[PDB]
Amino acid sequence: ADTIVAVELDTYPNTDIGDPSYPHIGIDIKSVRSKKTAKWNMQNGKVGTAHIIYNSVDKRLSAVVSYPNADSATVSYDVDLDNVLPEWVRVGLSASTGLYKETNTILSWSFTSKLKSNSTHETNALHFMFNQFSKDQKDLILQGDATTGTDGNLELTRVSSNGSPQGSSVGRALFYAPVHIWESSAVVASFEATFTFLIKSPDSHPADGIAFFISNIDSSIPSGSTGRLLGLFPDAN
Amino acid sequence: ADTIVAVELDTYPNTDIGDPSYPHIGIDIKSVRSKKTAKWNMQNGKVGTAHIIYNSVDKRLSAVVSYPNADSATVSYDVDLDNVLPEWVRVGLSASTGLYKETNTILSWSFTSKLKSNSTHETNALHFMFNQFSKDQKDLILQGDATTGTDGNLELTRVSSNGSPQGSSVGRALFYAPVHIWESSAVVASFEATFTFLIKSPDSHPADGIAFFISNIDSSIPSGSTGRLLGLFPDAN
Amino acid sequence: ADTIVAVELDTYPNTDIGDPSYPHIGIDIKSVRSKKTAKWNMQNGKVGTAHIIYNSVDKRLSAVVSYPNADSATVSYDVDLDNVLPEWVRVGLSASTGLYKETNTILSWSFTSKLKSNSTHETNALHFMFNQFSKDQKDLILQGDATTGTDGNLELTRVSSNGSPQGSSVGRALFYAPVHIWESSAVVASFEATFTFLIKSPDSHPADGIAFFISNIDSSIPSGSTGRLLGLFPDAN
Amino acid sequence: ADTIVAVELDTYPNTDIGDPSYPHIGIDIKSVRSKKTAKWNMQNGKVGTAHIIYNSVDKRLSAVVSYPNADSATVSYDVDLDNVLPEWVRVGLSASTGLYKETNTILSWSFTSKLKSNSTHETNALHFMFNQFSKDQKDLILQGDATTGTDGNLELTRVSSNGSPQGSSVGRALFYAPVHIWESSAVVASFEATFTFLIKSPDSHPADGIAFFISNIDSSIPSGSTGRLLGLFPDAN
Ligand SMILES: [Ca+2]
Ligand SMILES: [Ca+2]
Ligand SMILES: [Ca+2]
Ligand SMILES: [Ca+2]
Ligand SMILES: [Mn+2]
Ligand SMILES: [Mn+2]
Ligand SMILES: [Mn+2]
Ligand SMILES: [Mn+2]
């Protein structure tokens, strides 16, 4: 099985796998049963923004989510990612629906990783920024039901020709290049990610959510990971 | 009196003001008596690099210092800088000598500050990078004995025409623009700084050190702040 | 008199000073009588974006302006800016109204300048990005009628309490730090700027326009530079 | 055959394929017979730096090369790259030796590409920076004799265990992700690259050179492209 670290924007409360009884933001370390959660006042049909930050000095994975005109939600968890993830990873976005559903539309995604060595300075970095997505977006690896180019956006889960979200859908987008998150000479390693999203549903109960994740380079959607598993995990262990 | 937050590279042990009995890196919050220190294996005559990082989510000020071919030293301290510093600050480098002495030569200095609001994204930033310093470096405010342009470098303390460091010297360089470190709409604020330095002395006992600092915009060198006070503090309280 | 280089977004045709008979984008080198113009299909009440680029190898000042859902306009002019401007400059935005009027609202402004020397690499840079403007925006020098903080924006010219633009107004905003655009060791120097603007008027004939400019560090609004002079020039020579 | 655009640092004069009678920098558009050259005072055994710049407004490919303590060389050529290259490309470094030889050592490589659309702003970008290269550098595609990790560097051509360069060698390194250089909504597209290199030879006549290139995504070393063909072209047409 893959190795996954993720920040989840979890729209549906599954209380038997430890979700709180409300939409929430969570930090997931090798399990869908988040290590830490915070209440998230999710707004159906509004564009929101998520930010994720980490560095190897402090060893704290943190995230913040907001909408215009609204207060933010934040969550943090102390974890040494070099003890969880391999030295080379891929980074991605994932989303799912089940019997309950929503659009999982990404309007923008940026990421920056840096490795500073002890050689005079000495800086190594990767940065990408998407503010549109075209039909043939060659620097993304699309998995499952994910598509690019409809209204210039990344649709992680299936949307009907009329714009209605579909149930029982899972999809992911991974950046094409592998990312180097640990190196033996690094004195500080850091990453930051931001994405803007639009979660809409005809229903009072949207599901299931969107996640930013970091994985082994060869990660793939686990079998049966629709719905509450967010396209990330094979089971709820 | 000014308000100062600093990371010190302290080359001389002053044990009556709480220094450990060796060169050390420290976090200074409104006092020269560091809140946290770590041992620093300072190398006379070699170029080193320091990195300083902070964000408002985690509220942890961290620093790392290294030389080529050597292990690093690191220190961290939990502190909410919005409860210490004003909303607008200046950022700078400071150094001093006393009866013991050293060169306090800066070969490069970079800084990045970011304020992310809840408006769609919404990013505000300041970045500067110096890899040389000319004679008339109009975007630096020089204080005390600091000069620019000798061999293209920033000499924080006085150096004789022959290159010998002088005693009883203090000097600082502040970036010209004020820096916005808190704003009411920000959901995450962060800063990072890096500088490369060359501390050389003819003597077995160099003094006194170099610091990266953040201050009120109108900060000036305190009277009598040569030597152990690092150009930062009026007394050792 | 100041030395000015500017890219104008000129909303009102003043045919006796060489304007074409339509709104236009122009390159202004020490005169309001542009060296080069292109037709600009200005849209009253819509948010547009302008981009300005230059480097010292090619010695070509270029600009592009667009709106969502619309084609762009572009203009270029061959000019060695080191023969026009001093080594240190300030950068700014300017706008004016006369007997005809418009709002001259800035929603965002970014700028990046780089100087690459022949020392191993060797990079020097300044970058700033504003996506909001607060009441007391200490890193901007405001001149004339310019204000910050109304709806989080920079209003270059006066707007009544009800939001109606006023006539006979001029205002500018300059970044606080001086900018180094030439240095003797530089092998390549470049700059880029972007700003987003909202020009609205109750009238079929808006005036007078918005400009991005580069000037001597001590530049000030010339006497009598309302209206067709764009807050930039003392006369129409 | 591949499609190649390159900036060559050509160390050996092959006068029957149009080289000048001295080491030179050149712009190569689909042929090893440069469209434009400039004299290059190459220094055996010293670390140099090359810079390459282009944007779609000006349609001018420019390059500058220098050493510390020395004047620069520059070359430019007017060319619309959207009429030469496909919309998606890979970027790389190439080098070769023949019967004459040299080390073709890369100490650092950075690249930035940007696509600005007409949507509010709207920025898309890719950036990478290498200041070291490890043994298993997963974000590089190595071709031919290229290796990474010896003394932390990228050795484009073969070097014996004792450090002597070998003859009859060719090697390339391409960044792993495809790069988007044209898009239908872009109003400005640009790229910049920088690399630092060390060309050393025991011989009074080093050969053959190093190039930065942009190619179709599936580019490979052409058969027989050692020596004067620089690992880029199948023949000297
Ligand atoms: Ca759930
Ligand atoms: Ca001390
Ligand atoms: Ca006019
Ligand atoms: Ca040749
Ligand atoms: Mn959950
Ligand atoms: Mn101390
Ligand atoms: Mn005009
Ligand atoms: Mn040639």
Short mmCIF file of C-alpha atoms in Angstrom, two decimals, chain A residues 47 49 51 53 55 57-58 60-64 66-72 74-76 108 114 116-122 131 186-188 190 192-194 196, chain B residues 47 49 51 53 55 57-58 60-64 66-72 74-76 108 114 116-122 131 186-188 190 192-194 196:
data_model
loop_
_atom_site.label_atom_id
_atom_site.label_comp_id
_atom_site.label_asym_id
_atom_site.label_seq_id
_atom_site.Cartn_x
_atom_site.Cartn_y
_atom_site.Cartn_z
CA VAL A 47 -14.95 29.72 -3.62
CA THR A 49 -8.81 28.86 -0.24
CA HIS A 51 -2.97 26.87 2.70
CA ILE A 53 2.86 24.71 5.44
CA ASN A 55 9.42 22.77 7.61
CA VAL A 57 13.26 22.41 11.72
CA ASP A 58 9.90 22.73 13.47
CA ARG A 60 4.80 20.78 12.43
CA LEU A 61 2.30 20.28 9.58
CA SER A 62 -0.23 23.19 9.61
CA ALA A 63 -3.17 24.21 7.47
CA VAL A 64 -5.62 27.15 7.24
CA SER A 66 -11.06 30.45 4.63
CA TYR A 67 -13.72 32.10 2.49
CA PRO A 68 -14.08 35.80 1.64
CA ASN A 69 -16.07 37.65 4.37
CA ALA A 70 -15.58 34.75 6.82
CA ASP A 71 -13.30 33.69 9.67
CA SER A 72 -10.71 30.98 9.06
CA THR A 74 -6.85 26.02 11.28
CA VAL A 75 -5.29 22.72 12.35
CA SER A 76 -1.74 21.68 13.26
CA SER A 108 -5.93 27.25 -8.78
CA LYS A 114 12.98 24.22 -0.88
CA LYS A 116 18.85 24.61 1.78
CA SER A 117 22.25 22.89 2.10
CA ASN A 118 25.39 23.84 4.05
CA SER A 119 27.28 24.66 0.84
CA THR A 120 27.51 28.48 0.29
CA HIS A 121 24.02 29.23 0.54
CA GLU A 122 22.86 26.81 -0.96
CA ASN A 131 -4.44 29.46 -12.35
CA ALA A 186 19.98 19.84 3.78
CA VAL A 187 20.02 22.06 6.85
CA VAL A 188 16.39 23.19 6.32
CA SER A 190 10.25 23.32 3.65
CA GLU A 192 4.01 25.30 1.11
CA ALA A 193 0.90 24.66 -0.93
CA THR A 194 -2.22 26.71 -1.72
CA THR A 196 -8.68 27.43 -4.39
CA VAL B 47 32.28 32.01 5.50
CA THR B 49 25.37 30.99 6.56
CA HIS B 51 18.74 31.05 8.21
CA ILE B 53 12.16 31.38 9.85
CA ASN B 55 5.07 32.02 10.75
CA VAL B 57 0.19 29.87 12.60
CA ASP B 58 2.92 28.01 14.49
CA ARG B 60 7.83 29.50 16.63
CA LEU B 61 10.97 31.55 15.82
CA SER B 62 13.71 29.17 14.53
CA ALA B 63 17.24 29.58 13.25
CA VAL B 64 19.99 27.37 11.76
CA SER B 66 26.31 26.21 9.30
CA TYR B 67 29.64 26.21 7.50
CA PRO B 68 30.68 24.15 4.46
CA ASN B 69 32.02 20.69 5.53
CA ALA B 70 30.49 21.09 9.03
CA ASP B 71 27.38 20.13 10.99
CA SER B 72 24.77 22.78 11.73
CA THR B 74 19.87 25.21 15.55
CA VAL B 75 17.68 26.98 18.11
CA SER B 76 13.92 27.51 18.41
CA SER B 108 24.88 38.43 1.25
CA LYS B 114 4.28 37.34 3.15
CA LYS B 116 -2.01 35.92 2.93
CA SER B 117 -5.55 37.32 3.37
CA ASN B 118 -8.97 35.67 3.09
CA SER B 119 -9.75 37.55 -0.12
CA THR B 120 -9.35 35.27 -3.22
CA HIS B 121 -6.02 34.14 -2.58
CA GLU B 122 -4.77 36.76 -1.54
CA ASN B 131 24.75 39.54 -3.06
CA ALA B 186 -4.23 38.03 7.25
CA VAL B 187 -4.88 34.32 7.71
CA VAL B 188 -1.14 33.46 7.61
CA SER B 190 5.47 34.49 7.52
CA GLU B 192 12.37 34.11 6.27
CA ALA B 193 15.83 35.61 6.25
CA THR B 194 19.27 34.34 5.21
CA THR B 196 26.26 34.91 4.79
#
